[PDB]
Amino acid sequence: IETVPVKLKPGMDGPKVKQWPLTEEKIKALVEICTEMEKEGKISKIGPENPYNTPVFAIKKKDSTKWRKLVDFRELNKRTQDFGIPHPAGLKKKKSVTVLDVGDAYFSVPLDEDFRKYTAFTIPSINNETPGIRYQYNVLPQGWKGSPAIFQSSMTKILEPFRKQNPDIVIYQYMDDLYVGSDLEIGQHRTKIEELRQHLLRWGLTTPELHPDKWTVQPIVLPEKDSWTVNDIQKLVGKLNWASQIYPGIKVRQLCKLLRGTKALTEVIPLTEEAELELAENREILKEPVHGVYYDPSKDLIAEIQKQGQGQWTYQIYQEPFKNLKTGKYARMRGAHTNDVKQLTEAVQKITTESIVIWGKTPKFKLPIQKETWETWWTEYWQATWIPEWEFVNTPPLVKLWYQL
Amino acid sequence: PISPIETVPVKLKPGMDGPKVKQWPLTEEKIKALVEICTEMEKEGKISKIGPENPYNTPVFAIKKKDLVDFRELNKRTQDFWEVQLGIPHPAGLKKKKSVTVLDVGDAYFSVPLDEDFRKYTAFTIPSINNETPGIRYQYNVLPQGWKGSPAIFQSSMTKILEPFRKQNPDIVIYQYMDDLYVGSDLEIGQHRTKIEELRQHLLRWGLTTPDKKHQKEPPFLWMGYELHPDKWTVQPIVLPEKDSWTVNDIQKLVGKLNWASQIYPGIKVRQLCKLLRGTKALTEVIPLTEEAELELAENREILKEPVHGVYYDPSKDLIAEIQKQGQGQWTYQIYQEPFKNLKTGKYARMRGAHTNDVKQLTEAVQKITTESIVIWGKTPKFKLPIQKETWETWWTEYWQATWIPEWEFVNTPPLVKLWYQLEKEPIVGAETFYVDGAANRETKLGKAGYVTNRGRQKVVTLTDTTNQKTELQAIYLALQDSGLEVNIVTDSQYALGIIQAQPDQSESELVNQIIEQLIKKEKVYLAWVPAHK
Numbered sequence: 039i040e041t042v043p044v045k046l047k048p049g050m051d052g053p054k055v056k057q058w059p060l061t062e063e064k065i066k067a068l069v070e071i072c073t074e075m076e077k078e079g080k081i082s083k084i085g086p087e088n089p090y091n092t093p094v095f096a097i098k099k100k101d102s103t104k105w106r107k108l109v110d111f112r113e114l115n116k117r118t119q120d121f122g123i124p125h126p127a128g129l130k131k132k133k134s135v136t137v138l139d140v141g142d143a144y145f146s147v148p149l150d151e152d153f154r155k156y157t158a159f160t161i162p163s164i165n166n167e168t169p170g171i172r173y174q175y176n177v178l179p180q181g182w183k184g185s186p187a188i189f190q191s192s193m194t195k196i197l198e199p200f201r202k203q204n205p206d207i208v209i210y211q212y213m214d215d216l217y218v219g220s221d222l223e224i225g226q227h228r229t230k231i232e233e234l235r236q237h238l239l240r241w242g243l244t245t246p247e248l249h250p251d252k253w254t255v256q257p258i259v260l261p262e263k264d265s266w267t268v269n270d271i272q273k274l275v276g277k278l279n280w281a282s283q284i285y286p287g288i289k290v291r292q293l294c295k296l297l298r299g300t301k302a303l304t305e306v307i308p309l310t311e312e313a314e315l316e317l318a319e320n321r322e323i324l325k326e327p328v329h330g331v332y333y334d335p336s337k338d339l340i341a342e343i344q345k346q347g348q349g350q351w352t353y354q355i356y357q358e359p360f361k362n363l364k365t366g367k368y369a370r371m372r373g374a375h376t377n378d379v380k381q382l383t384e385a386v387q388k389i390t391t392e393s394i395v396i397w398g399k400t401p402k403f404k405l406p407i408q409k410e411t412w413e414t415w416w417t418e419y420w421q422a423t424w425i426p427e428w429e430f431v432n433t434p435p436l437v438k439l440w441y442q443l
Numbered sequence: 444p445i446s447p448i449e450t451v452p453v454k455l456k457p458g459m460d461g462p463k464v465k466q467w468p469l470t471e472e473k474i475k476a477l478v479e480i481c482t483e484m485e486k487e488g489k490i491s492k493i494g495p496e497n498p499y500n501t502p503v504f505a506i507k508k509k510d511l512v513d514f515r516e517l518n519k520r521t522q523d524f525w526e527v528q529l530g531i532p533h534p535a536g537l538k539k540k541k542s543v544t545v546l547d548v549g550d551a552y553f554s555v556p557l558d559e560d561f562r563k564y565t566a567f568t569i570p571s572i573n574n575e576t577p578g579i580r581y582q583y584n585v586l587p588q589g590w591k592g593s594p595a596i597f598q599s600s601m602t603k604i605l606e607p608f609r610k611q612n613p614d615i616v617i618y619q620y621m622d623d624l625y626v627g628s629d630l631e632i633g634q635h636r637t638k639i640e641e642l643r644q645h646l647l648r649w650g651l652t653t654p655d656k657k658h659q660k661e662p663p664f665l666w667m668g669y670e671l672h673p674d675k676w677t678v679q680p681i682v683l684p685e686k687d688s689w690t691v692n693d694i695q696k697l698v699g700k701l702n703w704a705s706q707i708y709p710g711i712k713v714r715q716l717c718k719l720l721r722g723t724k725a726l727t728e729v730i731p732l733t734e735e736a737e738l739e740l741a742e743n744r745e746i747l748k749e750p751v752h753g754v755y756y757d758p759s760k761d762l763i764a765e766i767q768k769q770g771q772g773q774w775t776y777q778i779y780q781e782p783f784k785n786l787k788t789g790k791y792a793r794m795r796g797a798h799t800n801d802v803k804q805l806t807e808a809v810q811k812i813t814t815e816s817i818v819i820w821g822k823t824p825k826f827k828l829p830i831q832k833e834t835w836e837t838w839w840t841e842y843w844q845a846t847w848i849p850e851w852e853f854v855n856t857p858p859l860v861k862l863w864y865q866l867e868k869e870p871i872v873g874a875e876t877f878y879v880d881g882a883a884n885r886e887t888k889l890g891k892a893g894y895v896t897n898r899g900r901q902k903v904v905t906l907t908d909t910t911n912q913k914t915e916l917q918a919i920y921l922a923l924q925d926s927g928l929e930v931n932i933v934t935d936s937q938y939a940l941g942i943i944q945a946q947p948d949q950s951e952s953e954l955v956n957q958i959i960e961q962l963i964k965k966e967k968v969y970l971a972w973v974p975a976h977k
């Protein structure tokens with residue numbers, strides 16, 4: 039077809055990102071996957087006169103043991119001009135949502151000849167006994183941001199009929215995926231979904247359950263004892279004192295009073311009636327999320343994760359520190375009982391998903407893990423068509439006891 | 444002999460123009476030479492004369508090779524290419540062979556055709572004795588010796604050219620590095636020799652000439668660090684110059700060679716040798732080798748006496764990785780498939796940094812190893828670690844940061860890495876409670892650190908030239924010193940606690956170490972944190 043010209047943001051140049059060493063099993067997978075796409079004409083081998091490069095790797099889904107190729111276009115997406123797909127606040131409320139992989143569709147459409155160069159990538163060789171296998175896309179790449187954009191039109195068409203004949207269903211496209219939500223009980227939903235697949239299969243883009251707003255923010259509950267020790271109170275006061283950054287109405291003087299005097303931690307203390315009121319009053323303020331927090335579209339979304347141990351993990355999406363748009367806990371997946379990275383990645387995924395559903399926008403992550411560790415194994419358990427941004431941190435001890443609530 | 448391979452399109456960096464530098468007229472000898480030499484490649488078609496319609500110029504030199512063009516500028520102006528050296532294959536990653544051979548594909552650089560369009564930038568000048576009127580000008584029609592694109596382009600060319608032979612003969616191993624071509628196989632000599640020739644003539648069929656089996660390098664192959672044999676690799680033993688007087692610069696280079704050695708021959712030490720550097724005023728100042736240094740320098744000559752032989756990689760077997768702690772922050776490891784038949788070995792030194800612990804450290808080792816393994820063997824090692832599964836479980840389940848260790852197995856090879864101490868999860872009944880506090884004047888650096896306990900006890904101390912933290916920690920130090928086996932210590936420091944949590948067993952701070960030692964001494968310690976200033 040006639041290709042739409044794509045260009046890089048002004049001044050910017052193509053990505054020259056290095057490839058991470060890939061394991062044996064996945065090298066072949068890629069090589070296999072690639073010699074084939076070459077035949078089909080999707081990609082073409084390049085030379086040395088091309089200095090750009092992007093990382094690639096392969097992942098696997100369930101019931102789909104067959105390897106799937108994945109490219110890290112984060113840098114490129116960042117340098118690619120902007121365009122054009124709107125976000126509905128509908129699926130936020132739906133009773134159920136289903137995600138569909140519609141990346142294939144893109145490979146049909148061609149990519150502007152002079153932009154192709156930028157899509158260069160490399161299949162590495164074990165022990166560098168061979169030079170890499172340089173390729174470059176000729177079609178629309180998957181996971182690239184311009185792709186769902188350029189394929190917009192055709193997409194709209196393709197759907198309109200399922201659309202117009204089922205305005206009781208929401209359809210959201212975020213890159214290689216499509217989110218399909220309905221309040222229709224599972225029976226008609228699943229069936230209506232499968233029907234939708236066919237509708238697409240019919241055109242040839244092939245497609246192989248969630249529960250929105252079931253995602254309610256978690257409360258911060260304060261412990262209750264029949265008797266409180268010096269220690270108990272101490273821990274309690276600290277908690278609140280910190281918590282007063284979210285709710286300015288929390289007060290800690292009455293309790294702080296009982297703590298005057300160098301007594302033993304084990305020592306037991308009886309609450310003065312004034313401390314009983316203060317506390318009771320605090321329990322109230324905590325019964326609901328702070329007032330005045332409203333999502334701003336022009337600012338980045340942020341997600342912090344804390345390791346709580348025992349397989350537990352807590353998190354907070356916010357734009358301004360202490361004004362969380364949503365917060366939550368997450369208990370490890372049955373079977374990751376021995377490794378954090380597995381868990382942490384899974385976690386990173388669910389959260390990004392909700393972010394998408396809700397604000398159709400991915401959060402930048404602050405990860406409680408050493409970069410080295412992350413970079414070595416995150417791919418071994420990834421399973422999304424997209425890759426969010428992230429940085430690595432040192433969990434303040436406090437923000438951790440708090441959310442433990 | 445030139446060639447018939449499609450040239451690679453090459454252009455100058457965005458918006459720059461070809462080199463324009465002057466020629467350094469030479470002696471009667473240095474010009475006569477370059478007149479001959481150039482008339483040679485001239486006749487061979489490699490370079491052709493150019494007239495005045497070429498405004499560029501690169502400096503031509505003439506050095507008598509005993510027992511040359513300056514493209515510095517050109518190169519700056521030329522585009523960038525991909526990677527002319529992703530990574531070198533490491534010996535431990537190669538699989539043995541029956542026969543091996545490296546061919547000096549040498550001057551093939553000059554067999555590969557340079558993009559016609561570009562050739563114009565390659566213009567250079569042969570001056571005049573008395574700077575008559577013109578100078579004899581030329582340009583290249585083939586990959587130039589010393590040009591930015593040369594390797595790169597030659598690399599690819601070679602690869603396309605070798606794809607079909609690689610296809611036909613899939614049991615043969617061709618490896619191209621620089622201007623060499625290492626080839627391996629499992630054919631018996633005769634069959635090997637044949638294919639080589641086959642190949643040889645195959646290249647020659649593109650213009651790339653090659654040496655006769657007559658003038659062709661043979662095993663062992665010296666591969667940067669190793670002596671390569673078809674069934675074994677060896678650590679080309681090392682030489683340490685025995686001498687009278689030692690200059691600084693010397694000791695440096697000495698500790699250099701040594702540090703690289705320690706990877707293969709652990710046991711090597713230089714602690715007393717680095718000391719000879721303290722205060723050094725000039726790189727050429729001679730130093731009196733201390734007696735301890737004498738005893739080290741010699742004990743090292745003994746170690747590096749015994750060469751090291753090794754094994755190659757057998758895919759049909761598992762990769763085993765074993766680690767040992769030589770000292771605080773020092774780990775040695777060796778990788779093998781069959782006990783005592785090493786594939787690779789090494790060691791890591793960890794500058795304590797802020798605050799770590801052995802387990803955390805052990806963890807970093809594993810990680811590093813895992814990554815280089817993947818690079819070399821494409822897979823990762825099962826591990827044999829000097830740590831108790833109980834020890835690990837305790838630590839990891841409770842650390843604030845995400846961490847993991849691949850399938851591993853405890854190996855009782857003392858000294859095992861363990862947790863020097865663990866803070867109690869809750870207050871200790873029947874234990875003195877020290878409420879500690881420290882403060883110092885930021886400006887004056889004047890401070891007081893002290894405590895008071897539920898059992899009446901107290902103490903305080905005035906500190907000259909201290910700080911905004913030292914005091915706080917000191918507070919706790921005192922508390923620890925005067926406490927006895929069981930203690931409860933409440934502080935308001937964030938820095939204090941946060942740190943002690945990580946249960947560090949080594950720190951950059953001498954102070955911290957004090958506390959750590961103290962902490963390890965106690966039988967049961969419970970540390971609690973309460974907001975400050977209320």
Ligand SMILES: Cc1cc(C)cc(S(=O)(=O)c2cccc(N)c2C#N)c1
Pocket residue numbers: 167532537538539540543544545616617618625626627628664666671672673674755
């Ligand atoms: C990929 C590669 C790199 C180098 C440096 C040398 C070779 S080789 O085939 O010449 C070789 C030489 C000696 C021992 C080996 N076991 C191998 C083998 N195989 C291959």
